[PDB]
Symmetry: C3
Subunit: 240 residues, 3 copies
């Protein structure tokens, strides 16, 4: 049996909302350590890692590790029927059902939901703690705007250490944010260009953290990192 | 006939309540009240509108009148005015509506719809609920994403549904919530039709689900100082 | 040519005014002030924009520039325009630069394009001054009734399948009426076109006469005006 109670179920609503557009399903490494998820879109050009430490959950119980096949299309639709509700996630031992219980502040309205888990168990490999050439911390909003505004112009953005440049039939546009909350560290300067479509899939996680961190290097994929307070982090990986 | 209602919002929110359920209806323009009673196209629901002349600030209506009205057409006319405008209605056979504040006047071509209203009897109900309107809305809405049928059960009330992605049950315990349960009943109602009734939520916050086997459910909304909007639904 | 406008929102609300009515127009960039004159694809109405160089902080126009821009493309490239962003234009391609420290810069391709008529000041029998937003709802609320208002001297009238609808106003922001009574039926669909320029000012003047097209005029704060010439239906 797996039982996690989250007083601010809003965390779960925003997280499911974040990855909903990128992947539809994933193996959840429901472990006593925490909830780790590793998954990839249908075009196999991006990877999403979600870390949810058991410390953040007010009550966490996981007798027996478990890899859940979650249809995140159904889960996010379920979690929408809840922003202050206390969400508890209960997974009975060897049931095809993941239970999601929504308890209001006032114990007046309680709603219980069941989802049909699937068979998706892929043994997640592990990335290394890598050293990136130039990394940038900026407001999540500005990164959303830069990705959104430059998307009406071109299908891809050109990032350089910082300048965001995208070109198209309408014209060309260069957006540069100098240091100030913005902080650039460029050990070795790198110029990599990324498809804007998938970046705007990552920008759906902007309600999780106020600051987004972009790790770029020529020998590794881009790493957009949104941090979940206490619980952990949400790492997006994209290839040039 | 002439009726002046300062709180023109009441007239706006009413028409917006029924535009989706019924498209046309007869209006029993009576010296007592503006009673309307019509049924949907598919014959699975009935609305009854009571507008006491007491709520109308100036109410004339001498000779008794049965107006057939195209609510869709009237809804657009009534949604032209803002929630602050003062609304007056006049007739002799073309419904006239005037909106004060700049003053604007429109005229709606009435139609020929005179089906004789029938008498509904005050029935006893096994279970009767009084919840805050907002809860009833969300409860209906969220459950509709799951499936298209709510199973309202009653214990000294639970809304439940089962669908393709899963199954759900929402339980509410005793604004405020009251559950007079003479006999415990459980029924299944179509959520699409219920979500037409929730369009009358701006009228007031007290929604009352008078519910009982052997009779159709009656979702009642209460227009303040005037009358009430009763929504009847047939179990499946 | 370089023209820096600090109240960048103006050019935002400007381009959004013409974006719908005119898809392509010629900006005759001039030393006194940028002027635009173009007509819709149905040739029933003309818009004339006047933005004087006095409003722009720095303004240098060392030529008779005739930029054929694509207003649809410019309303787009006028996105990422924070309302308080400061926007400057330069001089075949049009550059736009936005400054807040984010400092985005854009470049636009320009079409090659027709001349400009010399519209004269002309005598209007009935001129009406009303609150700008009130005009929009008058057109919008009446629009659900019919496809044409009948403006009289001031009452607006529409007639449709649902029924007739009349809205009236009296002298009193406020309302100001003027010489000879006129009643002209005007196309509604093109009247709501002009109402998209309401964010630029709080007063609209329905300068209206019988022997000439109606002139809905909006006064851009300080910098100039935005005139709309709509012909009556018959
Ligand atoms: C052994 O070396 C590998 C190499 C690549 C992926 C892999 O698997 C994973 C490991 C860790 C984390 C996530 C995944 N992969 C996944 O989770 C998803 C399963 C469904 C989902 O959860 O979205 N696999 C695919 O998309 C996929 C299917 C088939 C071929 C592919 C080739 C390249 C990229 C992806 C695929 C294992
Ligand atoms: C799983 O966790 C990881 C961990 C580290 C990297 C990673 O890769 C990616 C990361 C971000 C974006 C895109 C990709 N992935 C890619 O760019 C392409 C897609 C293949 C294709 O173009 O069809 N390669 C593979 O996925 C692949 C093929 C064969 C063998 C492999 C062995 C290990 C890892 C990947 C492969 C996936
Ligand atoms: C967290 O994902 C990671 C993390 C770390 C490594 C990594 O990829 C590898 C894995 C094993 C062995 C070698 C490589 N890496 C390489 O072979 C070269 C290094 C340069 C060289 O050829 O010397 N980089 C790439 O292929 C590559 C570049 C950019 C984006 C990419 C996205 C997906 C796959 C590859 C790339 C993927
Ligand atoms: C004789 O006993 C009855 C029994 C049932 C309904 C009835 O009619 C009404 C009574 C009061 C108020 C309004 C209506 N009638 C209506 O609402 C509309 C027309 C007027 C309107 O749309 O407002 N008729 C129908 O729905 C309808 C048409 C044909 C057969 C039906 C069978 C069952 C249910 C409805 C119909 C009279
Ligand atoms: C009008 O005022 C009323 C008054 C009382 C009941 C009523 O009925 C309903 C109320 C709410 C929801 C749905 C229905 N209606 C129904 O349940 C079904 C229609 C379902 C179907 O045909 O699939 N029957 C009839 O309405 C009907 C058929 C024949 C003769 C009748 C004589 C009197 C009353 C009704 C009928 C309508
Ligand atoms: C305001 O709507 C009403 C109100 C009150 C009665 C009523 O219906 C009747 C009218 C005259 C005589 C008998 C009945 N009642 C009945 O026939 C039986 C009771 C037992 C019996 O008499 O055989 N109830 C039902 O059919 C029925 C159940 C559920 C929902 C329904 C919705 C529409 C129509 C019927 C039902 C309709
Ligand atoms: Cl997928
Ligand atoms: Cl972390
Ligand atoms: Cl109908
Ligand atoms: Cl009552
Ligand atoms: Cl054109
Ligand atoms: Cl002027």
């Amino acid at each position: 049996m797996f039982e996690a109670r989250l007083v601010q179920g809003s965390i779960l609503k925003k997280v499911l909302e974040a990855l909903k557009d990128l992947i539809n399903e994933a193996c959840w490494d429901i472990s006593s350590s925490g909830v780790n998820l590793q998954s990839m879109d249908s075009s196999h050009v991006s990877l999403v890692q979600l870390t949810l430490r058991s410390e953040g959950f007010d009550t966490y119980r996981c007798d027996r590790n478990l890899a859940m096949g979650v249809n995140l299309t159904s889960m996010s639709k379920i979690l929408k029927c809840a922003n202050e509700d206390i969400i508890t996630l209960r997974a009975e031992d060897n049931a095809d059902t993941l239970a999601l219980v929504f308890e209001a502040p006032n114990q007046e309205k309680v709603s219980d939901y069941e989802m049909k888990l699937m068979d998706l168990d892929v043994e997640q490999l592990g990335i290394p703690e890598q050293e990136y050439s130039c990394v940038v911390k900026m407001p999540s909003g500005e990164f959303a705007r830069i990705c959104r505004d430059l998307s009406h112009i071109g299908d891809a953005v050109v990032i350089s250490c910082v300048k965001f440049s995208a070109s198209g039939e309408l014209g060309n546009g260069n957006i540069k944010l100098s240091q100030t909350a913005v902080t650039i560290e460029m050990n070795e300067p790198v110029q990599l260009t990324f498809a804007l479509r998938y970046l705007n899939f990552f920008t759906k996680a902007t309600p999780l953290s106020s600051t987004v961190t972009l790790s770029m290097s020529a020998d590794v994929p881009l790493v957009v990192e949104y941090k979940i307070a206490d619980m952990g982090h949400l790492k997006y990986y994209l290839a040039p």
